[PDB]
Structures are given as C-alpha cells and as structure tokens.
Amino acid sequence: GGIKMDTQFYDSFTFDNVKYSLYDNVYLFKSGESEPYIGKIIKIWQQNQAKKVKILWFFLPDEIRKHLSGPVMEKEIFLACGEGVGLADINPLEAIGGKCTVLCISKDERNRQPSPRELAMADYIFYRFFDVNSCTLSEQLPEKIAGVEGNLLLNSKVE
Amino acid sequence: PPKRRAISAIRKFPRDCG
C-alpha cells in the first residue's frame, strides 16, 4: 500500500525565543518601512522545506487614512474583512518580528468582552472591520473572514 | 514587542491604502 502524508500544518512554533500560536497577532516589517505592519496568523505550514504563514491584515489608522471620514481612538486598529486584494498575504515565517497584543471590544456575540486586565495590557484595540472591497469600515463582523470562522478571529475564548 | 527582521514582509494593500 504505502503511506504518503500531505502538507504539514502547525498550531504553534518558537521563533527567536518567542512562542507564536495560530490566531496570534504579530508585527511584520517590510524593507524600507519605518513602522511595522500588524497582522494575524491564520495558517502555518511547510511548503518545499520553506515555512510559511498566511497573514490576515490589520490596518493602522495611517494605512487607511484616505478612506476614513471620522476620528479614531489612540490605540485603535481595524481588522481586514471582505474579499479582494489587501485582505491577506502569504509570508515567510521568518518575517515575523514579534507578538502584538490586540484586544477586541466588539459587542458581537462571538467576542468575549475583555477584562480590565486585558484592556490594560493591550497594545491595540479594535471593534471595526475594514472591507477591502468597498474600502469602508463597519462594526458588523461577517460570518467568516478569509475562510476562517469569525469567532476564531476575536478574543481568546478564555482569559 | 516588535523586532525588525532581515527578511521582508510580503503585503498587498487595497486601493489608496498603505
């Protein structure tokens, strides 16, 4: 008969003395950019000995400033949603540059309301979702984003 | 905390974003 396994996937790894897990939020620097991007790991696998992560993007206010009609909170960022260019990008695992603590304050029922402790330790907070097609912000979380169920893209199920 | 890497991130942006 014979056995042949297909693609190896992962839930976690350690890189440069930091443990990263699926659905963690991370910094990623592009060459020539002064500020890092912030994104969420939504897949980890190995492909031809190369280690890859699929990153679902967050947007900092400066990154979508041209589409914003109103103000933002000091630590606010926005989770990409919808379908189209800008939603997500496959990245080398080696481009990950650190963990980012991002807390969701959405009233959506799939989000666990964060504790004061979690909010106190957050690098960024979000409750709005940037549709990359319309390029518009909404407080409505879609059923899924990038094929991932929405309840996996918010706060951890347990503090 | 952030830490710049030698290997660059890959990212596309929506129109008039970035």
Q: Report how far Cα A12 is from the mean position of its chain's Cα atoms.
A: 15
Contact list in A for residue B2 (CB cut-off 8 A) is 27, 29, 36, 97-98, 100
Say which experimental method was used: X-ray
Which of A16, A31, A86 minimises the CB distance to B8? A31
| Å between B6 CA and nearest CA of chain A | 8
Given a contact cutoff of 8 angstroms between Cβ atoms, the answer to whether A46 and A93 are in contact is: no
Q: Which domains does chain A have, with CATH numbers?
A: 8-152 (2.30.30.490)
The data reach a resolution, in angstroms, of: 1.8
